Amino acid sequence: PMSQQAIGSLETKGFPPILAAADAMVKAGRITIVSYMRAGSARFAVNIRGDVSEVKTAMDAGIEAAKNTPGGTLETWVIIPRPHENVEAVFPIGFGPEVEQYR
Amino acid sequence: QAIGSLETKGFPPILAAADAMVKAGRITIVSYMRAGSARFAVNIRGDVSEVKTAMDAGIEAAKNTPGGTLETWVIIPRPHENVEAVFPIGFGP
Amino acid sequence: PMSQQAIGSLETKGFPPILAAADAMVKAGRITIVSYMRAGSARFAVNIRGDVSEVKTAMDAGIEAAKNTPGGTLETWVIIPRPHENVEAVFPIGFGPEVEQYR
Amino acid sequence: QAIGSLETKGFPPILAAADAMVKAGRITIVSYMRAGSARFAVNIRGDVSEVKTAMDAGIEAAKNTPGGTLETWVIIPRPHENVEAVFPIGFGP
Amino acid sequence: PMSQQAIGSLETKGFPPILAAADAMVKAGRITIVSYMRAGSARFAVNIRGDVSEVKTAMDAGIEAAKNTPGGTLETWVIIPRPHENVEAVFPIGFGPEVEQYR
Amino acid sequence: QAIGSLETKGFPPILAAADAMVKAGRITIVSYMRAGSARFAVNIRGDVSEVKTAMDAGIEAAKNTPGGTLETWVIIPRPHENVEAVFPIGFGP
């Protein structure tokens, strides 16, 4: 009941910084971007999956890209190495059929 | 079964809380609520003693998350059945 | 054109305090919880129906439960003894088929 | 028919306003708007003299509600028909 | 690829001031109200179309009506004389079938 | 193709930005995002040199709009294809 793949989630204020973060993340490690969350208050979170070491290196790049985007604000981030299956069942952080082609 | 509900500012800390809760007691995460203003609540069910231990872990995980903040939480030991008929805190699919 | 049953509505900041309020309300009087409103800004309202004397005693318990929830904030409440039918027609405060079994 | 629209912060005060309005004049409540930021607007229609009396009662009910606040209101006597084609202030189902 | 008709868009805080603006606009010039946008934070925008000279006179009336509504706030407005077709394709500012009868 | 994204407070300034961008370079406006808190983002695609010229025009149009404010913007020259599989920045219908 715990997934093999880590989750990393990063949240910005602003849509352009989340795109910056997402692109930097997938260019920095063997990770898949699985989903995004429109959180309200102009905040957005991006969710990535991969082995924890790869998610950590991806997260470092996403953090920098968010902060370096003009007018962007990094709000919060987390890495969970081996998330319980019930988390994946309830939250939109699983692998959907549109990202299979990239994994 | 008891209900525990915990609410954070930010999506990453609600994930952290949820994962910590289900790894700390015999509970089921049944739903989450997008509250607006970048707040999210996670709802768990279990025997009250298990919900309590889970809640303690979830509070700590939310506060320990980079940039995460804990807003509010509750434990209701034996909720009236009318509550889960109206609020999305039941077990069913 | 005025209902036999009062409406009570109570609004909190935070989802956990609204659950606290709702549970305290239905445990304190002969009332039915009919609906909730996601108001934005992390505010939620719960709507109950019953005879006005029962809604008043329920409301007192809901107010206390909201205020006593960790991090919860009570925002606003009302009791309308005999609401006009047009209010029930437009606002989601009627009795739905999922709560018949509890009334 | 005239349109009256009244907006509160909070859901309980919009209920109070709506009920007071329909009990104060020959008007029909046609819709409500969830505006965001916990604001709600109620929309009524009737002859303008009736909408005026109703509006006065609704303003007082909103302000009199525990924790309720009145944000903004308007009365438009004879709205152009293009307005109700776009905004949800018409009578129809 | 640029429309013959200008767009004017006006945004208020509050729903009653947007109704005031919309009504004043269509009473002040040969314009069609095409749509409204629920922007969040209790802000609303109304979108009108017409020849630019007509949209300008309509906009002046909408600005005044918004400001003069009890508790209303004017937030922002624009007039674009000859919008590119790609703007109409992506943003909800075109003529829909419900407003044909008024144009 | 590159992605440019520009976000304003207010709906009128996003229209201004979008129109200025497509009139300043060989770009396609592919989508907009209602972000909440009355913020909106417009997303454009094109060769990066064209997206840059378009972005400059969009920044100026947003700031020049009465009451409009520019919040944030970005240009990504060569986005990874996983980004447009998840975010609504692709070309398709």
UniProtKB/Swiss-Prot annotation, chains A, C, E:
Disruption phenotype: Single deletion has a wild-type phenotype, a double ccmK3-ccmK4 deletion has slightly larger, aggregated instead of spatially separated carboxysomes, and has a photosynthetic affinity for inorganic carbon between wild-type and carboxysome-less strains. In another study single mutant grows slower in air and low light, double ccmK3-ccmK4 mutant has similarly impaired growth rate; ccmK3 does not complement the double deletion, while ccmK4 does. Heterologous expression of 12 carboxysomal genes in E.coli (ccaA, ccmK2, ccmK3, ccmK4, ccmL, ccmM, ccmN, ccmO, ccmP, rbcL, rbcS, rbcX) leads to the formation of bodies that resemble carboxysomes, have densely packed paracrystalline arrays and RuBisCO activity. These structures open the door to generating carboxysomes in plant cells to increase their photosynthesis and productivity, as well as tailoring bacterial microcompartments to specific metabolic needs and molecule delivery. The absence of ccaA, ccmK3, ccmK4, ccmP and rbcX leads to less active RuBisCO. One of its GO terms (cellular component) is carboxysome. InterPro entries: Bact_microcomp_CS, BMC_dom, BMC_shell, CcmK, CcmK-like_sf, CcmK/CsoS1_BMC. One of its GO terms (biological process) is photosynthesis. Induction: Carboxysome size and components vary with growth conditions. When grown in ambient air at medium light (50 uE meter(-2) second(-1)) there are 52 units of this protein per carboxysome, the numbers are stable under low light and high light, and increase under high CO(2) (at protein level). The CcmK3:CcmK4 ratio of 1:3.8 is stable over all growth conditions. One of its GO terms (molecular function) is structural constituent of carboxysome shell. It is found in: Carboxysome. It comes from the Bacteria. Keywords: Bacterial microcompartment, Carbon dioxide fixation, Carboxysome, Photosynthesis. Pfam families: BMC (PF00936). One of the shell proteins of the carboxysome, a polyhedral inclusion where RuBisCO (ribulose bisphosphate carboxylase, rbcL-rbcS) is sequestered. Assembles into hexamers which make sheets that form the facets of the polyhedral carboxysome. The hexamer central pore probably regulates metabolite flux. A minor shell protein of the carboxysome, a polyhedral inclusion where RuBisCO (ribulose bisphosphate carboxylase, rbcL-rbcS) is sequestered. Hexamers form sheets that form the facets of the polyhedral carboxysome. The shell is 4.5 nm thick, as observed for CcmK proteins. In PCC 7942 there are several CcmK paralogs with presumably functional differences; replacing the central pore residues (34-37) with those of CcmK2 from this organism (Tyr-Glu-Lys-Ile) allows the bacterium to make carboxysomes, but the expression level is too low to know if the carboxysome is functional for CO(2) fixation. The tight homohexamer forms a pore with an opening of about 5 Angstroms in diameter and is positively charged. Belongs to the bacterial microcompartments protein family. CcmK subfamily. This is Carboxysome shell protein CcmK4. It comes from Synechococcus elongatus (strain ATCC 33912 / PCC 7942 / FACHB-805) (Anacystis nidulans R2).
